[PDB]
Design a protein around this ligand. Structure first.
Ligand SMILES: CNc1ncnc2c1ncn2C
Length: 164
């Protein structure tokens, strides 16, 4: 079913994550963490305080797909055991030093061809696949985008609901 998923997405906020490489999304899925540039770090920390759920929706650049979505379970935190991100050019380890814990809601992929009917009012009504890293996605678009993903039957949202 999909009722707990809908409950988690109730009045959530959604942010588009654009990763320049697959390796970091794979690491994120394994280790339950994410890091972004300081400008986005600040926005996510603010939104983590503002909403029942903050949802990250991941797409690797040039893949033509989303690779899944996850819910922030913490604010960012610096200085722990370093995450071995593959660093994009011009991006230093210090720039990515803030670590968010995340709980994955879906690790299955969705091709851009299946979301062509969803546009994002916070990005000039462009298709929701289009957007810079950190672009916020409007509630109705974001909900519908998440509900398009194939079910991830490996996930139990019972714990995530307890965190809300
Ligand atoms: C682990 N964070 C990241 N990895 C790869 N690329 C990124 C990232 N953040 C923003 N961009 C463009």
């Amino acid at each position: 079913g999909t009722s707990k998923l809908k409950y988690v997405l109730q009045d959530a906020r959604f942010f588009l994550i654009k990763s320049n490489n697959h390796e970091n999304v794979s690491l994120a899925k394994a280790k339950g963490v994410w890091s972004t540039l300081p400008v986005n770090e600040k926005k996510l920390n603010l939104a983590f305080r503002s909403a029942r759920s903050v949802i990250l929706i991941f797409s690797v650049r040039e893949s033509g797909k989303f690779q899944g979505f996850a819910r922030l379970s913490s604010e960012s935190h610096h200085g722990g055991s370093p995450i071995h991100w593959v660093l994009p050019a011009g991006m230093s380890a210090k720039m990515l030093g803030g670590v968010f814990k995340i709980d994955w809601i879906c690790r299955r992929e969705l091709p851009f061809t299946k979301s062509a009917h969803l546009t994002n009012p916070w990005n000039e009504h462009k298709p929701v696949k289009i957007g810079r890293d950190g672009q916020e996605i409007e509630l109705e678009c974001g909900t519908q985008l998440c509900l398009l993903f194939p079910p991830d039957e490996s996930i139990d949202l019972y714990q995530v609901i307890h965190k809300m």
